[PDB]
C-alpha cells in the first residue's frame, strides 16, 4: 500500500553558498546544510499525500528544530541541547500534498556538528505528524560550524624537551591555537646527540573524550605521522619544520561539548634509534575552524 | 649488492608510468608514480658507487620530468601551487625532489622570485640529517640550479633579485654543505670499513668539486670579491674540514681550476692557510700544483708578464720556509723538492738576476747543514733528490761561465756520495767541455783546478787538458806562463798516471808560448830570457816526465825543443838545443831494450839536426860524430845501415859514410834483404851525383850479378821491375 | 768515396778539428778513411770511427799506442796505395827521395806527410798525396800551419781527388784528377 504520505523539508534558503562535508560512520559521505548560529531557518514542509481515495487523520503537524547529542550510540539518554518547534497544523487530516510554511527565528547554535565513534551531535528538522499509533518522523540533518575569527595571541611554544645524557633538543612550535588550514612552522634545535637515532616524526594526534566525569572513554587515533627527520644527528643542526594541516580533514579544538565529550589535539614528538626505541613528548594545540572568508592579505 | 638491481627494477616501472600519466595530462597522478619511487633513495643499504649511479639514473629521469614540467610552464600551462603541492607526501626525499623541480621554474618562470626562493631551497636542504642523501640531492640541486644563478651579464628582465653577491653566498654554502658531510663520509656506517669510507671520499669528491667549477665560471667574481669572500669563504671550509683527504682533494682543486691571475696575490693568504692544513696532507702536491701553474702564467706572453710589484723571490723563501716551520714529521725528500722549486722558479722568473739563485742554494747549504744529516750515501731517494736538485743550475745557465763563476757552488759538491761524487764531476766538467768555453779568467783557473780537486781526490782529463790549451789560451806576453805553471803544479799533485797525457801538449803550450814570442820578437824584449825560462821549464815538466819513468816521449820533445830553439833565436839557444841534444841522446841510450824505437829516435833525430842548420860545424861535428856514435850501438846490419847513409847529408865528407854504408850490407845472411838495400846505395848516390860519379856506374854492375843468384817468391819480380825502372830514371834521354 | 787527411796534434798543437771541417765530414757518405797520423789522442781516431768504418791508420812522428802500423798498402778495386806519415825522409820535403818511396814499394798511390804543408804530385807514372795538417798543427820548419783534408772518389782505372784548405775563414778547394797507367 506505500506510505500513505511522504514528508519532504525545503528550506527557502537551501540553495545559498555551498557545501562543505563531512565524514560519517563506515566512512560514507553525507551533506547536510551548513548553518551558523544566529541564521534563521526557514522552508516549506511539504507533505505529500501518496494514497488516493484514503485519507490521513492525525492529532497535530508540527516541524522541530532539535539539536541533540547522542552518546555511547544509546537511546536512552538522547540529549536535546536545541529544541526549537514550529506547529505546522493542528489536529486535522491530509488529503493531499499540503505545503506547511515554517520559520524558526534565529536559531540558536551553541556548537558546530561534529560527529565522533561514541559522540554524534547533529542538527536536524524533525517533523512530528502525531497519529493515533505512529507518528511519522521525518529527519532533515542540518550541519553547523563554530565560527570564531583569529586569536589575539598566539604564543610560541618554545620548550626544552629530552632524554638525560641521551638527547636534549629545542623545539619551538610559533603558535599555539591553530585554525584548521594553518600550518606548523618552526624549528628542532639540537643541544645533546648520544643515541643511534633513527628518525623523527611528528604525530598529530587526537584525545576524544568522551562521557560525563568518572565515565571517560578517551578514544586516542593519530590521523597523521608527520615526516621530518632522519638518521642521528650532531651538535649544531637546526630543522625548521612546515607542515600543511589542510590534508587531514581536522576538527575544532571542542572544550567539554555540554560536559559531555571534549576534542583535544595534541602534537607528539616521536624518536626512533636504529634499535627501535620510542621517546614521545605531548604538547596541547588548540584547533579552531576560521571562516569560509575571500583569500588575500595579511595583517 | 642485489639490493641495487631491485632498486632501478621499481625506478623504471614508476618511470614509465609517470611518463604515462604525464602524457594523460595527469600531472598530480604521475607525481604520486614519482612520489611512489624517490623513496628508493630512503635506503641506506646501498654502496656509495652503487647509491651513485641510481642517482644519476634518477637524475636524468626526473629530468625527463622536468622537460615535462617545463614545457608545462613555459607555454603557461602552468598548474598552480606545486610549490605547495608537493609538500603533502609523507616520505621526506620525494617531497623535496619535486620541490627542487617547482624550484628551477619558478626561478626562470618567475624572474622576481629569483634571491627568495635561493634563500630557501638551499636552507630547506637540511630538512634532511644524512651524510650520503644529503650529497646527492645537492648536487642534483647543482645540476638543476647549474646556470640560473646570476651574474653582471645579466638579462635585463630587472624583477629580478639577487647577484654575483647571491651566487657567491649560495655556493659557499653549498660548499659548506658538502665539504662538512663528505667528513661525515670518515665516521659514517661500521668501524671495520675505514678504508672503504675513505676510498668512496676518493669518489664522490668530485661531485663536490662540480661547486668549485661552478665558482670558476663566475666572471663576476673577480680578484676583489675572490680573495674578500670566495677565498677566505672556501678558506674557512679549508680550515674546518678536520680530515686530511678532504682537506688533499680540495685544495689541488682549488688551484686548478681557478685561474692562475687569482693565485697571483693569494701568494701570502693562500699559503698560511696551507700552513693551517694537517700533518696528513700531500702539502708537496699542493705546492707542485702551486709552482706549476704559477711558473705557467710566469712563461705565457700575450699580457704584462709579473707585476713589478710583486718579487716573488723573497716572498717565496720567507712563505715556504714557514710551510716547513709548521709541518711535523717530515722525509728529507719533501725540503728537497721544495728547494728544487725555488732553485727552478728563481732561476726561469729571474733569468738576468744570478744572486738570486746564489741566495737560495746559500740556503740549501744551510738548510742541510743545520739538518743533522750524516755523509750522504747513494741508497736512499735523498741522493736521487739532491742530484736532481744540484742538476738544475748547471743545466739552465746558458753560459757555462756561470757556473764557474759561483763562489758558493763549491760548498754543495762535498756532502755527496763517492760514485755520486765522481759520476757529478765528470758531468760539470763535460758540461766545461762538451760546450766550447773560451779563453779562462784567474779566477775559474782556480775554480777548474779546484772542481779537479772534487774529482780526482782517465783520458776526461786528457780531454779536458785538450781544451785546457784553448780555454786557456790567453793574449798575454807573460801571464799565459803562469796559467801552464799552475797546470804545471796543481795537475802535477793530481798524482802520476794523469801527467802523461796533459805535459806533453801543456810543454807545446809552452811551445805555442814559446813561439808566441817569436812573434813578440820585436814586440818583447825579454822574449828570449823567456823562453829560457820556458825552454827549462819545459826541462822541468820534461823532469816530471823523468820522475814519471817516461822514456820515448820526451824524445821527440826535446827534439822539437832542439828545433823550437834554433828556429826562434833567442839567446844561448845553440847550447840549449845542445843541451836538449844531450838530453835526448842519454835517454835513448840510458834504458830502452827494443830496437825499432831506437831507430825512430835516431832517424828522428839526425832528421831534424840535418835542419838544425844553426849548430855550427864546431858543434854539428861532434853532433855528426854523436849520431854516428848512436847508430853504432844497434844490433841488427841493415837499420844501422840507413842511419849512416842518412849520415852522410849531414856533410852538406858525404862519400865517406857512403863507403861504410856499402860495408855495412856485406856481411847479411838472406840474399833477399841485401838486394834492395844494395839498390837504397845506388839511389843514395844518385842522390848525392845529381847535387862521386863513377862508384855508381861499378855498382850497378855489380848488382847485376848479385840479383839472379837465388830462388823466388812473389818479391823477388817486384825488385826486378824496380831495378828496371830505376833504369828508366837514370835513363834521362 | 776515400778520405785523406793528417798531421793532426788533436791534443798537441790545437784545440780539434776546425768547425767548418768537422761539419763538411757527416758520416754516411764516404765509404771508406785513409789518414797520415799524428792523431795525438784516440779522440781523432775515435772520431774519424764515427765518420766511417773503413779507416786505415799509419803512425805519425808524435802518436802514442804500439798496435797501430808503420805502414799499409792497399789494392781497391784498380789501384795501388801506400800509406806512410813522412817523418822518414831525408831534409823532408826533397822530390827525389819521394820519388823513390814509390820506386821501393811499386804501389801506384801514396800517401805521405809530416811536414803540416799540404803537397800532391803525379810523377814517374805515379801519384802522391802530402795532406799537411788538417789542423793547421804547427810545425818548426814552417811558421803559418793551414788545416786541410783531402777526399777522393776511385770508380775504375780514376780517382777524383778533392781537398779542402783553410785559407782565411772560409772552405777553399782545388781539385785534381788522378788515371791509372
Given at each position: 500500500f506505500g506510505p500513505i504520505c511522504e514528508i519532504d523539508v525545503a528550506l527557502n534558503d537551501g540553495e545559498t553558498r555551498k557545501m562543505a562535508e563531512m565524514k560519517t560512520e563506515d566512512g560514507k559521505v553525507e551533506k547536510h546544510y551548513l548553518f551558523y548560529d544566529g541564521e534563521s531557518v526557514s522552508g516549506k514542509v511539504n507533505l505529500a499525500f501518496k494514497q488516493p481515495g484514503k485519507r490521513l487523520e492525525h492529532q497535530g503537524i508540527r516541524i522541530e528544530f532539535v539539536g541533540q547529542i547522542e552518546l555511547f550510540n544509546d537511546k536512552s539518554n538522547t540529549h536535546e541541547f536545541v529544541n526549537?518547534?514550529?506547529?505546522?497544523?493542528?489536529?486535522?487530516?491530509?488529503?493531499?500534498?499540503?505545503?506547511?510554511?515554517?520559520?524558526?527565528?534565529?536559531?540558536?547554535?551553541?556548537?558546530?556538528?561534529?560527529?565522533?565513534?561514541?559522540?554524534?551531535?547533529?542538527?536536524?528538522?524533525?517533523?512530528?505528524?502525531?497519529?493515533?499509533?505512529?507518528?511519522?518522523?521525518?529527519?532533515?540533518?542540518?550541519?553547523?560550524?563554530?565560527?570564531?575569527?583569529?586569536?589575539?595571541?598566539?604564543?610560541?611554544?618554545?620548550?626544552?624537551?629530552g632524554i638525560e645524557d641521551c638527547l636534549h633538543i629545542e623545539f619551538e612550535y610559533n603558535k599555539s591555537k591553530y585554525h584548521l588550514k594553518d600550518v606548523i612552522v618552526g624549528k628542532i634545535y639540537f643541544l645533546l646527540v648520544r643515541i643511534k637515532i633513527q628518525h623523527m616524526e611528528l604525530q598529530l594526534i587526537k584525545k576524544e573524550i568522551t562521557g560525563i566525569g568518572p565515565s571517560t572513554t578517551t578514544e586516542t587515533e593519530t590521523i597523521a605521522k608527520y615526516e621530518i627527520m632522519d638518521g642521528a644527528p650532531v651538535k649544531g643542526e637546526s630543522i625548521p619544520i612546515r607542515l600543511f594541516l589542510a590534508g587531514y580533514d581536522p576538527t575544532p579544538t571542542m572544550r567539554d561539548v555540554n560536559k559531555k565529550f571534549s576534542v583535544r589535539y595534541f602534537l607528539n614528538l616521536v624518536l626512533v634509534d636504529e634499535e627501535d626505541r620510542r621517546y614521545f613528548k605531548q604538547q596541547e594545540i588548540i584547533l579552531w575552524r576560521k571562516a569560509p572568508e575571500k583569500l588575500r592579505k595579511q595583517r | 649488492?642485489?639490493?641495487?638491481?631491485?632498486?632501478?627494477?621499481?625506478?623504471?616501472?614508476?618511470?614509465?608510468?609517470?611518463?604515462?600519466?604525464?602524457?594523460?595530462?595527469?600531472?598530480?597522478?604521475?607525481?604520486?608514480?614519482?612520489?611512489?619511487?624517490?623513496?628508493?633513495?630512503?635506503?641506506?643499504?646501498?654502496?656509495?658507487?652503487?647509491?651513485?649511479?641510481?642517482?644519476?639514473?634518477?637524475?636524468?629521469?626526473?629530468?625527463?620530468?622536468?622537460?615535462?614540467?617545463?614545457?608545462?610552464?613555459?607555454?603557461?600551462?602552468?598548474?598552480?601551487?606545486?610549490?605547495?603541492?608537493?609538500?603533502?607526501?609523507?616520505?621526506?626525499?620525494?617531497?623535496?625532489?619535486?620541490?627542487?623541480?617547482?624550484?628551477?621554474?619558478?626561478?626562470?618562470?618567475?624572474?622576481?622570485?629569483?634571491?627568495?626562493?635561493?634563500?630557501?631551497?638551499?636552507?630547506?636542504?637540511?630538512?634532511?640529517?644524512?651524510?650520503?642523501?644529503?650529497?646527492?640531492?645537492?648536487?642534483?640541486?647543482?645540476?638543476?640550479?647549474?646556470?640560473?644563478?646570476?651574474?653582471?651579464?645579466?638579462?635585463?628582465?630587472?624583477?629580478?633579485?639577487?647577484?654575483?653577491?647571491?651566487?657567491?653566498?649560495?655556493?659557499?654554502?653549498?660548499?659548506?654543505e658538502m665539504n662538512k658531510l663528505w667528513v661525515r663520509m670518515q665516521h659514517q656506517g661500521h668501524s671495520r670499513d675505514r678504508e672503504k669510507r675513505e676510498r668512496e671520499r676518493q669518489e664522490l669528491r668530485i661531485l663536490v668539486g662540480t661547486n668549485?667549477?661552478?665558482?670558476?665560471?663566475?666572471?663576476?667574481?673577480?680578484?676583489?670579491?675572490?680573495?674578500?669572500?670566495?677565498?677566505?669563504?672556501?678558506?674557512?671550509?679549508?680550515?674546518?674540514?678536520?680530515?686530511?683527504?678532504?682537506?688533499?682533494?680540495?685544495?689541488?682543486?682549488?688551484?686548478?681550476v681557478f685561474p692562475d691571475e687569482f693565485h697571483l696575490q693569494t701568494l701570502n693568504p693562500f699559503l698560511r692557510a696551507c700552513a693551517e692544513l694537517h700533518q696528513n696532507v700531500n702539502v708537496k702536491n699542493i705546492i707542485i700544483a702551486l709552482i706549476d701553474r704559477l711558473a705557467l702564467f710566469a712563461?705565457?706572453?700575450?699580457?704584462?708578464?709579473?707585476?713589478?710589484?710583486?718579487?716573488?723571490?723573497?716572498?717565496?723563501?720567507?712563505?715556504?720556509?714557514?710551510?716547513?716551520?709548521?709541518?711535523?714529521?717530515?722525509?728529507?725528500?719533501?725540503?728537497?723538492?721544495?728547494?728544487?722549486?725555488?732553485?727552478?722558479?728563481?732561476?726561469?722568473?729571474?733569468?738576468?738576476?744570478?744572486?738570486?739563485?746564489?741566495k737560495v742554494l746559500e740556503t740549501t747549504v744551510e738548510i742541510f747543514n743545520k739538518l743533522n744529516l750524516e755523509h750522504i750515501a747513494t741508497s736512499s731517494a735523498v741522493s736521487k733528490e739532491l742530484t736532481r736538485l744540484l742538476k738544475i743550475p748547471v743545466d739552465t745557465y746558458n753560459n757555462i761561465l756561470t757556473v764557474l763563476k759561483l763562489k758558493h757552488f763549491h760548498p754543495l759538491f762535498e756532502y755527496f756520495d763517492y760514485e755520486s761524487r765522481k759520476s757529478m764531476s765528470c758531468y760539470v766538467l763535460s758540461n766545461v767541455l762538451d760546450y766550447n768555453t773560451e779563453i779562462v779568467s784567474q779566477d775559474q783557473v782556480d775554480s777548474i783546478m779546484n772542481l779537479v780537486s772534487t774529482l780526482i781526490q782517465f783520458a776526461d782529463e786528457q780531454s779536458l787538458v785538450g781544451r785546457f790549451i784553448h780555454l786557456l789560451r790567453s793574449d798575454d806576453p807573460d801571464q799565459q806562463y803562469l796559467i801552464l805553471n799552475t797546470a804545471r803544479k796543481h795537475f802535477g799533485a793530481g798524482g802520476n798516471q794523469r801527467i802523461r797525457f796533459t805535459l806533453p801538449p801543456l810543454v807545446f803550450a809552452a811551445?805555442?808560448?814559446?813561439?808566441?814570442?817569436?812573434?813578440n820578437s820585436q814586440m818583447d824584449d825579454k822574449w828570449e830570457k823567456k823562453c829560457q825560462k820556458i825552454f827549462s821549464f819545459a826541462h822541468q815538466t820534461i823532469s816530471a816526465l823523468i820522475k814519471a819513468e817516461l822514456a820515448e816521449l820526451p824524445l821527440r820533445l826535446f827534439l822539437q825543443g832542439a828545433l823550437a830553439a834554433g828556429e826562434i833565436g833567442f839567446e844561448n839557444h845553440e847550447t840549449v838545443a845542445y843541451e836538449f841534444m844531450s838530453q835526448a841522446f842519454s835517454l835513448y841510450e840510458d834504458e830502452i831494450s827494443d830496437s825499432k824505437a831506437q831507430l825512430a829516435?835516431?832517424?828522428?833525430?839526425?832528421?831534424?839536426?840535418?835542419?838544425?842548420?844553426?849548430?855550427?860545424?864546431?858543434?854539428?861535428?861532434?853532433?855528426?860524430?854523436?849520431?854516428?856514435?848512436?847508430?853504432?850501438?844497434?844490433?841488427?846490419?841493415?837499420?844501422?845501415?840507413?842511419?849512416?847513409?842518412?849520415?852522410?847529408?849531414?856533410?852538406?865528407?858525404?862519400?865517406?859514410?857512403?863507403?861504410?854504408?856499402?860495408?855495412?850490407?856485406?856481411?847479411?845472411?838472406?840474399?833477399?834483404?841485401?838486394?834492395?838495400?844494395?839498390?837504397?846505395?845506388?839511389?843514395?848516390?844518385?842522390?848525392?851525383?845529381?847535387?862521386?860519379?863513377?862508384?855508381?856506374?861499378?855498382?850497378?854492375?855489380?848488382?847485376?850479378?848479385?840479383?839472379?843468384?837465388?830462388?823466388?817468391?812473389?818479391?823477388?819480380?817486384?825488385?826486378?821491375?824496380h831495378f828496371h825502372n830505376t833504369l828508366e830514371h837514370l835513363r834521362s834521354r | 768515396l776515400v778520405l785523406v787527411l793528417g798531421d793532426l796534434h788533436i791534443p798537441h798543437r790545437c784545440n780539434s778539428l776546425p768547425a767548418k771541417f768537422k761539419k763538411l765530414l757527416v758520416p754516411g757518405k764516404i765509404q771508406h778513411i785513409l789518414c797520415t797520423g799524428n792523431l795525438c789522442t784516440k779522440e781523432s781516431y775515435d772520431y774519424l770511427k764515427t765518420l766511417a768504418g773503413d779507416v786505415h791508420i799509419v803512425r805519425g812522428d808524435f802518436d802514442e799506442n804500439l798496435n797501430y802500423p808503420e805502414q799499409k798498402v792497399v789494392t781497391v778495386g784498380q789501384f795501388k796505395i801506400g800509406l806512410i806519415h813522412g817523418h822518414q825522409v831525408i831534409p823532408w820535403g826533397d822530390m827525389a827521395s819521394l820519388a823513390l818511396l814509390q820506386r821501393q814499394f811499386d804501389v801506384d798511390i801514396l800517401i805521405s806527410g809530416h811536414t803540416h804543408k799540404f803537397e800532391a804530385f803525379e810523377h814517374e807514372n805515379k801519384f802522391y798525396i802530402n795532406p799537411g795538417s788538417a789542423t793547421g798543427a804547427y810545425n818548426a820548419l814552417e811558421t803559418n800551419i793551414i788545416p786541410s783534408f783531402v777526399l777522393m772518389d776511385i770508380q775504375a782505372s780514376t780517382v777524383v781527388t778533392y781537398v779542402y784548405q783553410l785559407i782565411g775563414d772560409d772552405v777553399k778547394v782545388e781539385r785534381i784528377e788522378y788515371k791509372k797507367s
Open positions: 526549537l518547534v514550529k506547529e505546522l497544523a493542528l489536529p486535522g487530516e491530509l488529503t493531499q500534498s499540503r505545503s506547511y510554511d515554517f520559520e524558526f527565528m534565529q536559531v540558536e547554535k551553541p556548537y558546530e556538528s561534529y560527529i565522533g565513534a561514541n559522540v554524534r551531535l547533529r542538527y536536524f528538522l524533525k517533523v512530528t505528524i502525531v497519529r493515533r499509533l505512529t507518528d511519522l518522523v521525518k529527519e532533515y540533518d542540518l550541519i553547523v560550524h563554530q565560527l570564531a575569527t583569529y586569536p589575539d595571541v598566539n604564543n610560541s611554544i618554545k620548550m626544552e624537551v | 649488492e642485489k639490493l641495487l638491481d631491485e632498486a632501478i627494477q621499481a625506478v623504471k616501472v614508476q618511470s614509465f608510468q609517470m611518463k604515462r600519466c604525464l602524457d594523460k595530462n595527469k600531472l598530480m597522478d604521475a607525481l604520486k608514480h614519482a612520489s611512489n619511487m624517490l623513496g628508493e633513495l630512503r635506503t641506506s643499504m646501498l654502496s656509495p658507487k652503487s647509491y651513485y649511479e641510481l642517482y644519476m639514473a634518477i637524475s636524468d629521469e626526473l629530468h625527463y620530468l622536468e622537460v615535462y614540467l617545463t614545457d608545462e610552464f613555459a607555454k603557461g600551462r602552468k598548474v598552480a601551487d606545486l610549490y605547495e603541492l608537493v609538500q603533502y607526501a609523507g616520505n621526506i626525499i620525494p617531497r623535496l625532489y619535486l620541490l627542487i623541480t617547482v624550484g628551477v621554474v619558478y626561478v626562470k618562470s618567475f624572474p622576481q622570485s629569483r634571491k627568495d626562493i635561493l634563500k630557501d631551497l638551499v636552507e630547506m636542504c637540511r630538512g634532511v640529517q644524512h651524510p650520503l642523501r644529503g650529497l646527492f640531492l645537492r648536487n642534483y640541486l647543482l645540476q638543476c640550479t647549474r646556470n640560473i644563478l646570476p651574474d653582471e651579464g645579466e638579462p635585463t628582465d630587472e624583477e629580478t633579485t639577487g647577484d654575483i653577491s647571491d651566487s657567491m653566498d649560495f655556493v659557499l654554502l653549498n660548499f659548506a668549485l667549477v661552478r665558482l670558476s665560471q663566475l666572471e663576476g667574481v673577480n680578484v676583489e670579491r675572490y680573495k674578500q669572500i670566495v677565498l677566505t669563504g672556501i678558506l674557512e671550509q679549508v680550515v674546518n674540514c678536520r680530515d686530511a683527504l678532504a682537506q688533499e682533494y680540495l685544495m689541488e682543486c682549488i688551484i686548478q712563461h705565457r706572453e700575450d699580457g704584462p708578464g709579473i707585476p713589478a710589484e710583486i718579487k716573488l723571490f723573497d716572498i717565496f723563501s720567507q712563505q715556504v720556509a714557514t710551510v716547513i716551520q709548521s709541518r711535523q714529521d717530515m722525509p728529507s725528500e719533501d725540503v728537497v723538492s721544495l728547494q728544487v722549486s725555488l732553485i727552478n722558479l728563481a732561476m726561469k722568473c729571474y733569468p738576468d738576476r744570478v744572486d738570486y739563485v746564489d811551445y805555442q808560448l814559446a813561439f808566441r814570442y817569436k812573434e829516435a835516431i832517424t828522428l833525430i839526425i832528421g831534424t839536426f840535418e835542419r838544425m842548420k844553426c849548430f855550427s860545424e864546431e858543434n854539428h861535428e861532434p853532433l855528426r860524430t854523436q849520431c854516428a856514435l848512436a847508430a853504432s850501438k844497434l844490433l841488427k846490419k841493415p837499420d844501422q845501415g840507413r842511419a849512416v847513409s842518412t849520415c852522410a847529408h849531414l856533410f852538406w865528407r858525404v862519400m865517406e859514410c857512403l863507403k861504410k854504408a856499402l860495408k855495412i850490407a856485406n856481411q847479411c845472411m838472406d840474399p833477399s834483404l841485401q838486394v834492395q838495400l844494395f839498390i837504397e846505395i845506388l839511389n843514395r848516390y844518385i842522390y848525392f851525383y845529381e847535387k862521386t860519379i863513377q862508384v855508381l856506374n861499378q855498382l850497378i854492375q855489380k848488382i847485376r850479378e848479385d840479383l839472379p843468384n837465388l830462388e823466388s817468391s812473389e818479391e823477388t819480380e817486384q825488385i826486378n821491375k | -
